Each structure stands twice: as structure tokens, then as C-alpha cells.
Amino acid sequence: PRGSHMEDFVRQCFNPMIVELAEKAMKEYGEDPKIETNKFAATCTHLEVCFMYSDGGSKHRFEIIEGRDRIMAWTVVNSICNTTGVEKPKFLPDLYDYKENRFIEIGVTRREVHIYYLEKANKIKSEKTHIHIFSFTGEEMATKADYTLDEESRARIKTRLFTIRQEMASRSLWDSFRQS
Ligand SMILES: [Mn+2]
Ligand SMILES: [Mn+2]
């Protein structure tokens, strides 16, 4: 195959359960983790960030949409919309907040945080879908300046993102990863 250094780093940087879910998500979209290795790394990163995020709240706060099968992911969205009356989002969100009663779109970008959110806001164009963006530089940006979780839970996410960046840069892999 294509013995890429990025593929072997991804498999040692993320735990096997995350790597397996990212592989299933890329193949479900008809893409190869062995060839498009940058999206392989990004898919694993978005996955771990979403799971660290759901771990920050109370025991029953979040329903995790990301990481499920696409058909079942929309099934839980139906049950949430049909039991709480919240409008149906057009695009698949990542979580649902049972405390604040809204869906959450979590993004991870290598550019400045207001770039990615500005694109996500245009694409979403829903209504109450909360947007929370993280950067690889340590910045974050959320809708209405409402960051949902307290500072500690968001801080350890920022620390992990910068650790992944350092490990990539130490392997001469950060430059190509940033240009995508
Ligand atoms: Mn998602
Ligand atoms: Mn997202």
C-alpha cells in the first residue's frame, strides 16, 4: 500500500476505538484512510474532541450523535426532535445538550477560529444549533459566547490539540496537515 508516515502516526497517537470509528466513517463516505491521510488524522481528532466534550458535563447531559452509523445518527435526531420539539437540523450535529436544549456542532480547524465558524454558520443557517470551534493554537469560539462547559473541561481539550500539533511537527507532518 501507501506506507505513509502520517498513517502510522495516527494509529499510535489515537486509541484503537477512535481509529476504528474514523475508518468506518471514511469508508462510509467512499474515502481511503491509507491515501487521504490528512483527513484520516482530522477525522480522529474531531472524534476524540467530541468525546472529551461529552465527558465534561453531568452524567446525563449529552446525547452523542457523532460516532454512530449515519442511519442511526439521524434516528436519534428524530427521537430528540420528536420528544423535545426542537426544529430538525439540516446537517448532522455532534451532540445534543439536554440541559440547554439544543444541538451542538463541534469543529476543529487549523486556521483562525472565526474563519471556520463563519463558514459553519453559513452552511448551518438553522436556528438554535450551537456552534463551538476549537483551534490547534489554543483558541475557541462558541455561539453567543456561551461555551457550555466550564473552563477546565475546555482547557484540557486545548492542551490535547496542541500536543497533537507538537507530535506532528516533531515528525515533519504538521506542514502538510495545515495545508488542507
Ligand atoms: Mn458529528
Ligand atoms: Mn463537527
Answer yes or no: is 66 a known binding residue. Answer: yes
Among 7, 69, 100, 120, the one annotated catalytic: 120
- Do the beta carbons of residue 81 and residue 39 sit within 8 Å? no
**1: containing domain:** 1-180
Other residues' Cβ atoms within 10 Å of the Cβ of residue 172: 9
> Cα torsion at 11, 17, 20, 26 (round to 10°)?
-100
Q: How far apart are CA 116 and CA 106, in angstroms?
A: 11
Q: How was this structure determined?
A: X-ray
Among 36, 94, 167, 175, the one annotated catalytic: 94
Q: How far apart are CA 55 and CA 40, in angstroms?
A: 23
Q: How far apart are CA 163 and CA 50, in angstroms?
A: 17
- Do the beta carbons of residue 168 and residue 178 sit within 8 Å? no
Query: What is the 67 CA–ligand 1 centroid distance (Å)?
Result: 7
The 3-state DSSP class for residue 101 equals: coil
Q: How far apart are CA 76 and CA 148, in angstroms?
A: 21
Q: How far apart are CA 136 and CA 140, in angstroms?
A: 9
Provide the pairing of β-strand 130-135 with 102-109.
parallel
Q: How many angstroms is the resolution? A: 2.4
Q: How far apart are CA 141 and CA 71, in angstroms?
A: 30
Query: What is the 47 CA–ligand 1 centroid distance (Å)?
Result: 8
- 107 alpha carbon, closest ligand: 2
Query: What is the 106 CA–ligand 1 centroid distance (Å)?
Result: 7
Query: What is the 91 CA–ligand 2 centroid distance (Å)?
Result: 10
- 65 alpha carbon, closest ligand: 1
Query: What is the 47 CA–ligand 2 centroid distance (Å)?
Result: 9
Residue 94 falls in the annotated catalytic set: yes
| Sign of the C-alpha dihedral computed for residues 180, 143, 89 and 156 taken in this order | positive
Residue 24 falls in the annotated catalytic set: no
Q: Measured between alpha carbons, how far is residue 145 from residues 82, 130, 148, 155 in Å? A: 28, 10, 9, 16
| Sign of the C-alpha dihedral computed for residues 129, 156, 51 and 85 taken in this order | negative
- The DSSP call for residue 98 is T
Q: Which residues contact 24 (CB under 8 A, 6 or more apart)?
A: none
| Sign of the C-alpha dihedral computed for residues 76, 80, 81 and 82 taken in this order | positive
Q: How far apart are CA 141 and CA 53, in angstroms?
A: 14
Answer yes or no: is 130 a known binding residue. Answer: no
Answer yes or no: is 5 a known binding residue. Answer: no
Number of domains in the chain: 1
CB hemisphere CA count around 4 (13 angstroms): 18
